[PDB]
Amino acid sequence: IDDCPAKARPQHIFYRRFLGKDGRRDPKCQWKFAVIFWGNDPYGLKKLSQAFQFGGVKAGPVSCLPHPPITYCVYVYCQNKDTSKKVQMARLAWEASHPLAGNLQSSIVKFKKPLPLT
Amino acid sequence: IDDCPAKARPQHIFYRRFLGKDGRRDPKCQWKFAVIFWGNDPYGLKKLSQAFQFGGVKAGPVSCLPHPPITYCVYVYCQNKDTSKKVQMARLAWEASHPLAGNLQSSIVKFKKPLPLT
Amino acid sequence: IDDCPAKARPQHIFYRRFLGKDGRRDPKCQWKFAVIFWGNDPYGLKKLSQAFQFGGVKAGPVSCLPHPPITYCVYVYCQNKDTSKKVQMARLAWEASHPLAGNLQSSIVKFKKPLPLT
Amino acid sequence: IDDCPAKARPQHIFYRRFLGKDGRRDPKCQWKFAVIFWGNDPYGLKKLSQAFQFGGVKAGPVSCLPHPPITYCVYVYCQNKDTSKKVQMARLAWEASHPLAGNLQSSIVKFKKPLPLT
Amino acid sequence: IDDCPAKARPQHIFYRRFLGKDGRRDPKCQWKFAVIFWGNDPYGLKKLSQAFQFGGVKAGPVSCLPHPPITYCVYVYCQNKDTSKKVQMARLAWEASHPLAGNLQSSIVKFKKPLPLT
Amino acid sequence: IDDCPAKARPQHIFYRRFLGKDGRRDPKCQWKFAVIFWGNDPYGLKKLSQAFQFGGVKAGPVSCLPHPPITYCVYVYCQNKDTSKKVQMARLAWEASHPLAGNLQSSIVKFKKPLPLT
Amino acid sequence: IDDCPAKARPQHIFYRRFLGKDGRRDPKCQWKFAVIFWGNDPYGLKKLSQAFQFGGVKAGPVSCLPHPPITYCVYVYCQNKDTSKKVQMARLAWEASHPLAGNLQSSIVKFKKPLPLT
Amino acid sequence: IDDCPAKARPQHIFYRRFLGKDGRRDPKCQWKFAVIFWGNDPYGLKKLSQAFQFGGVKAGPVSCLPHPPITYCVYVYCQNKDTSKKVQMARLAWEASHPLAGNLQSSIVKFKKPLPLT
């Protein structure tokens, strides 16, 4: 937690408690699952990206989405189907608990072939 | 919210924000789903029971469980499979956000035949 | 049977014969299943609750249901899907065989995560 | 009930109450389902055959089974999957309720193509 | 074949060739499957019943069907789903090959619980 | 039948009777299904190919198979899953009924995208 | 590649690179799968047939299709469901990359019983 | 094609031909599907990102992946399951056809909730 930059620490401590065992170091599992968080606010999305780094849950850098109002997004990568939806619920928890946090719309994601994270 | 007794109001306001549309008045849906919250603490379970009364989510009174340390439990009844697990996540959110709240272990529940709530 | 209070003994002896092996002591099985009996009559529901205590089948205390005419209910917890529906049929048997017994409407119940009874 | 011969009347009245709506006249349903009752006793099987004649449930005459102690059997034909298992439970009810009745072992049966009963 | 009565021998020799391995002595398999042959002609149905006796396929005696023109039927019991439909095709083969044989309408049958033949 | 060359007429008349409705002109159905007949004998396979031409069943010309003893094969194209296996049984019928006919080993075939026959 | 005739070598080298491991020598797998390429051009279909010979992928000789404009076709036999569709994509790749090549319409094929290639 | 920057034009023209109808303007479909291309080379990934912009297929900007040798990735978003795998095959086609192009490893991706592209 000391290693994680300060800005996302309030979030980090929250998610660390929220997720539990399914969020920390389950090597046997394969990572087939991620969850994309998209929002117009780059600031909060960066905080979210910093917020999730774990044994079972990792998040990439902030990224733009295809435009047919720029949409920014950050993918949050998980192990199983449980933690995939649980992270989605983890953020909504923070939004409800902490009103000052922005509202982010997200969808669960399933990958067929495994991803290179272990 | 004025009608709901005070003790569960902090919880109520939380869940009211957490759940959203799937937690309020969806008449078309049939109630096949509930979620049981079991814990040794009657006090917190009573607060939980008072906490959930909604259009899509209703909770019965506190009840004991069969003993082969008395276990108390309160069922929380939902509409669909989404709100069933979402309520389970809603409580865990409160526990993580508010540390002073007790730890309650729970399981999602599926009913075959419909239940008389509309 | 001597231990079980008298009032539910006529029922108990009935269910003991009706259920058989699937109703007595199957430890290998996990309890994912229960069956809720709801009715307006507290008296008969109490008798039902006393009636079911077994190795594979356990019943909690009488409990109220959420009101949008008070409805009382008693959950009857089972091991597998077979005994879950079989108990539902076991009560209907008693109602048909013994006319004096009240009419109780019930639904089979499925739980996702296991329940703490062994 | 007057038309049904006397010997199976005690059974008939029982099953008539036990089965209910799913046992009487549901024309929309197709008969894909039957249930075979096999036992060594021809006497009781004949009584069973006389016992089941209904709108949704019909039973053929007593019949022998292939021998690799003669086994006699009587098929009981139903509409849906509900009534198929319900009849199986209906007999077990009679055996438990009435001890003097013999013990009959039976299995539920599924037919792919429909059967000529309407 | 010498043991099998003469009348069904032309049929027997036919089915013996038609069915093959799946029709003779597969003990590992459980008998969940039968096929009912129903027809108005008792004579041909008796010949059919005599025609099928095998390691994997057995047929009971001729039996009547429930009447809402008497219908007679004979069940032919199999091991797996393959032989169940194969026997249905085996008879149709005989009808097409031998025109003098009567036309019999039949359906494949599935049993949930196993049957006492081994 | 007059149009079909003579050599396969004995077969043709057989299959015409064996197959019935599912073998003649069902336009609503899509052809997703064929059945491949492979054998070392080109002569009999040619007769088989001539034997099957129908509204619901069509057969292509005799063709070789990949060699890692030349294997010849002829595909027989059907409408639904019923007629696909039924044709497989139709040939086995001929082999059993008529001993002089050669023994041909075959497998049912399923195609994902539809085939250009209507 | 030296053994394969020259005309299909440009194709062969292409498919050899395109397919990879799933296209070369996987003995453990069973061949349940093929893919049929149909087209009006016999010339290109012959080139295609010569083009595919592999450890995991084999193609038979050019063959006609049933006519209710002669259609020629060549089946390409695979191991698993992956290579079945991959070959279909492999040809489309060649058509897009090399414009001079003809346009061939094809469908993936599934066989129930295994095929004699190993 | 004039609008698309030059560097990815050779790719663009290729994919435009490869994909066809399923790659251009199918509004009725919902976008549940994307495909992630990950590789160590930022240069080629940028070319890939520029290469895919279509009615049915859109690609976001180049993005990094979580590190437990920096991995860069670019997501390519599709409509249905067909185009999702087809794009994966579309790139492999280019790699096989054009050797000078780098080798990129990728996996198909499924999203539960729809994505905001129409």
Numbering used by the authors:
A (entry chain A), B (entry chain A), C (entry chain A), D (entry chain A), E (entry chain A), F (entry chain A), ...: 1024 to 1091, 1097 to 1146
Question: What's the publication's text?
Answer:
During our crystallization trials, we obtained three different crystal forms of the kLANA CTD, all of which contained higher order oligomers. The monoclinic and orthorhombic crystals of the kLANA CTD contained pentameric rings of dimers, whereas the cubic crystals contained tetrameric rings of dimers. In all structures the oligomerization interfaces are formed by helices α1 and α3, and the interface comprises an area of approx. 500 Å2. In kLANA, the interface is mostly hydrophobic, whereas it has a more hydrophilic character in mLANA. The angles between two neighboring LANA dimers range from 0° for mLANA, 72° for the kLANA pentameric rings to 90° for the kLANA tetrameric ring. Moreover, both pentameric ring structures of kLANA dimers display ring puckering, where the interface between two dimers is oriented out of the ring plane. This provides direct crystallographic evidence that the interface between LANA dimers is generally compatible with a range of relative LANA dimer orientations. Due to the hinge-like character of the inter-dimer interface, in vivo native LANA oligomers might differ in shape from the closed ring structures or the linear chain observed in the respective crystals.
